[PDB]
Structures are given as structure tokens and as C-alpha cells.
Write a protein that binds this ligand. Structure first.
Ligand SMILES: Cc1c([C@@H](C)Nc2nnc(C)c3ccc(N4CCNCC4)cc23)cccc1C(F)(F)F
Length: 464
């Protein structure tokens, strides 16, 4: 086929070593024009490239620029009519349009259907681009609303149904019987007495797992691309990832706060022993994020140095805490090995993936140069997308655990730092640790009790 000239169309230039590199062919690098062309190739459908592109394109192209590029890709100019056909059109007769029909059937219609397929995948899996930019959605609805054609009528309707469902879903069922909600000292409804030791450790780990599962499942892969969660626009590009990270920081600091602010040695042992029991139920539910929240708390500077406290921790709980720490040893080797074999539901730990993504961002160049021509390094984005795909494969499996609205709201409003900054609070926790257990030369003072309720744990065995 005779593709349109370059003076009227920019997506028909032949491939060369200066505009696209390969590795269905796998694209390695290329210009933004060559990526849009291969994103909507007329010879075959490329679902893997479409999924990887729309997840990672924001690291090299703005959403407004992408919509303009795919609209320009859509409006393919038709060739000039032949002389014999133009005089039939002048007389009001129907032209032959032999080559014109073959060009529409073999190029224009296949490309235009690929552009619409990209538009459907965009609004279906990355609709947040249109929530953050209303004008982007106005352009998208304006574009698909003015598409004329019979073969494209079904595509316009499907994209419309998805856009409408996304707007309606913005306002807001077990397969098995969930276990019974466990309670300890705090009776149901008495939200004034909810605390670490008053609530049941089984239900503390259950509700935290339900809370952390939802926070994990709301994280989209694009929030982990281009290190956007560490830039100025982190609040706009990674709101769910930051909500997941800030929750992990709040819960970790709360565990440390419950330990160092318990000045009595006997009560502090019961506090640490209860948190280890909470970690044990985290392992049962395969909530690996909750497991390492306890590991990070026990390894922090104020808590790890409490030799007098951990001396009274029973040996069965020491081994449970040891096996939980070994998940982080050797670049989280054992954590990946356990997660890869565990069946969902589960809550992954984001730390190692963010670490391996950042090493890919820093270890690979943004652009590749060929004959002095900068090309978007797309294999770099594909490698980052593969990592986000490993975390995302558990995004859809729910837990078979009943939500307790009072307990869930208690952990959502945990503010251990109160109104002070983190550096001031972390320095306060360490100075509090030196107070409850001074260093080697200084003696160990006694402190009065602060809890008036029994310190005995009800256990981690579900009472059925
Ligand atoms: C198991 C455990 C733990 C766990 C949570 N901590 C650890 N576990 N294993 C090993 C082999 C560790 C090796 C180094 C290491 N870090 C601490 C932070 N500074 C850098 C070195 C912490 C380890 C903490 C506290 C107490 C206990 C107890 F044995 F008492 F239960």
C-alpha cells in the first residue's frame, strides 16, 4: 500500500535506525511518533504493548499530549481522487474509487479501530487521568462523540458505557462464611476503651489486614513509574501509594509508642509479647506488609536496644519474631520465596519492589541515542512495568473476613506523632527508650504501672 506522504501525515515515515529499535516484535526504543504508530499498528493487535504503554507513558509524555497524538493518528488523510473519478463526482455520479476503497479497508479502518481500542483501554484501566484533568475527559468525549462510521459505532458505545460507569462508580458479598469477630476486654460498642491490650489480638490483625488490603488494592501501577512518588507532584501522581506508605509509618510508630511509653518493665514485656502475637496472625493471613511493620518496629532504635524487655520474651515468641525478620535478610530473598508460593488473598510488602524499581530507574538511561537522535528508552519502562505486575497480581483477591467498623475506624485515626514532626517524635521515642532502660553504667530504675486491666493475652487460637 502507498502510505500517505510526510507533508500531510506524520505516522507514515518508514522505520529506520534513527526512530525505532527492536529487541510480534518487541520494541526496545524509539521516538514518541514511532511509539504511537506501533501502539496502533494496522497489521496486528499488540495487547501487551498497549498495556505496558498506558501504564508507563507518563514518564515520557503528558496525558494531554498523548490524546493529541492519538487524535492526529486517527485523522488519516485520504488520497486525491483520480481524474476519471473527480469528473464523476462533478456530474453527481458515483466514482469508482478502487484504490481509495483498498486504502480505507487495509489501512484507515484498521488503524482507526486500534486508536479506539487504545481509547477503551485508557478509560478502563487508567481513568484517573481523566479524574485529575476534566478538560482531558472533555476532549476525549468530544473526540469519540464525533466519530462517524458504522464499523466504529460499537466501539464508541462501549467507550461511552465505560466512561459513564466510571463516573457513577465515583460516588461509592462473601463467597464463604467469615469467621466470628473476636473480642477481649473491650466490649462491642465501647470505643472509649479501645487500645493495644484491650482489643483481641486476633481481631487487631484481622482488621489491620482488611485495612491494609484495601489500601494495597487501590494502588495503581503508574504510581510506581518514573519515581513520581518522590517528586514534587507526588500527591497528584501517587495518592494511593503515599496513603499506603503513610499508614505503614503511622502503624510502625504506634507500635514503638506503645512500647517505649510503657515505663513498667513487666507491662512492657506484655506489650511486646502482644505485638508478636499480632504478627503471628499476620503470618496466618499472609499479610506480609503487616508482618514487616512489626519487624520494623522491633528493629527500630528505641525498641531493639531494650535488652531487659526481650530477655523475658518466651523462646517460642523469639523464634516467631526471628523467622519474620529473616524475610528481610539477603535483599528480602525469603519474602519473595514465600510470596511466590502463597495463594491469594495476601497483602504484599512494597518496600523491596520500590527499591528494585529505583535501581532500574537509576541504572538505565531515559533516552537512547542513535546517529545523534534521542529515542525514548521503552525497555526501561517495560522492566519497571514487569515489577509492578508482580505486586499487582494480588490486587483482585478479597479477604473472607468481616469488617468491624468501630475497630477499623480506630486504626484509621491512629495519630502517634500527634502534632509534632516525625524527626522530633523519633528523637522523643529514643530519649524515652533511654529513660525506661538506661545504658550499661546507669542502674535500672523501677516505674509504676499504667494499666489497670489484666495483661494476660487471650491467645491467637480462634475460638470456634
Ligand atoms: C527476633 C528479635 C528481633 C528481630 C526483629 N531482629 C533481628 N532478628 N534476627 C536477626 C538475625 C537480626 C539481625 C540484625 C538486626 N538488626 C537490628 C537493627 N539494627 C541492625 C541489625 C535485627 C535482627 C528484634 C529484637 C528482639 C528479638 C528477640 F530475639 F528478642 F525476639
Amino acid at each position: 500500500m502507498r502510505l500517505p506522504s510526510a507533508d500531510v501525515y506524520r505516522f507514515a515515515e518508514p522505520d529506520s535506525e534513527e526512530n525505532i529499535i527492536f529487541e510480534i516484535p518487541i520494541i526496545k526504543a524509539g521516538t514518541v511518533i514511532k511509539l504511537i504508530e506501533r501502539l496502533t499498528y494496522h497489521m496486528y493487535a499488540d495487547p501487551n504493548f498497549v498495556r505496558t504503554f498506558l501504564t508507563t507513558y507518563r514518564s515520557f509524555c503528558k496525558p494531554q499530549e498523548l490524546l493529541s497524538l492519538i487524535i492526529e493518528r486517527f485523522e488519516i488523510p485520504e488520497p486525491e481522487p483520480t481524474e476519471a473519478d473527480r469528473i464523476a463526482i462533478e456530474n453527481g455520479d458515483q466514482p469508482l474509487s478502487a484504490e481509495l476503497k483498498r486504502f480505507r479497508k487495509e489501512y484507515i479502518q484498521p488503524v482507526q479501530l486500534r486508536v479506539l481500542n487504545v481509547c477503551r483501554h485508557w478509560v478502563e484501566h487508567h481513568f484517573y487521568d481523566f479524574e485529575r484533568d476534566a478538560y482531558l475527559l472533555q476532549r476525549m468525549e468530544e473526540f469519540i462523540g464525533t466519530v462517524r462510521g458504522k464499523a466504529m459505532k460499537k466501539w464508541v458505545e462501549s467507550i461511552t458505557k465505560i466512561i459513564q460507569r466510571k463516573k457513577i462508580a465515583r460516588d461509592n458479598t462473601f463467597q464463604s462464611s467469615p469467621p466470628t469477630v473476636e473480642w477481649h476486654i473491650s466490649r462491642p460498642g465501647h470505643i472509649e476503651t479501645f487500645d493495644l491490650l484491650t482489643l483481641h489480638p486476633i481481631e487487631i490483625a484481622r482488621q489491620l489486614t482488611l485495612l491494609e488490603s484495601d489500601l494495597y488494592r487501590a494502588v495503581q501501577p503508574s504510581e510506581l513509574v518514573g519515581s513520581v512518588w518522590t517528586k514534587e507532584d507526588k500527591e497528584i501522581n501517587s495518592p494511593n501509594l503515599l496513603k499506603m506508605i503513610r499508614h505503614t509509618t503511622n502503624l510502625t510508630l504506634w507500635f514503638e509508642k506503645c512500647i517505649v511509653e510503657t515505663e513498667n518493665l513487666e507491662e512492657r514485656v506484655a506489650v511486646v509479647s502482644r505485638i508478636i502475637e499480632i504478627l503471628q496472625v499476620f503470618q496466618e493471613l499472609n499479610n506480609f506488609n503487616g508482618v514487616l511493620e512489626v519487624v520494623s518496629a522491633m528493629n527500630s532504635s528505641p525498641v531493639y536496644r531494650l535488652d531487659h524487655t526481650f530477655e523475658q520474651i518466651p523462646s517460642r515468641q523469639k523464634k516467631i519474631l526471628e523467622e519474620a525478620h529473616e524475610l528481610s535478610e539477603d535483599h528480602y530473598k525469603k519474602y519473595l520465596a514465600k510470596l511466590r508460593s502463597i495463594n491469594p488473598p495476601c497483602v504484599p510488602f512494597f518496600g523491596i519492589y520500590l527499591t528494585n524499581i529505583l535501581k532500574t530507574e537509576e541504572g538505565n538511561p531515559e533516552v537512547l541515542k542513535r546517529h545523534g537522535k534521542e529515542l525514548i528508552n521503552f525497555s526501561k519502562r517495560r522492566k519497571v512495568a514487569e515489577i509492578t505486575g508482580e505486586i499487582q497480581q494480588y490486587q483482585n483477591q478479597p479477604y473472607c473476613l468481616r469488617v468491624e467498623s468501630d475497630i477499623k475506624r480506630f486504626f484509621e485515626n491512629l495519630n502517634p506523632m500527634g502534632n509534632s514532626m516525625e524527626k522530633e517524635f523519633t528523637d522523643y521515642l529514643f530519649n524515652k527508650s533511654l529513660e525506661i532502660e538506661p545504658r550499661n553504667p546507669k542502674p535500672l530504675p523501677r516505674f509504676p504501672k499504667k494499666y489497670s486491666y489484666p495483661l494476660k493475652s487471650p491467645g491467637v487460637r480462634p475460638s470456634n
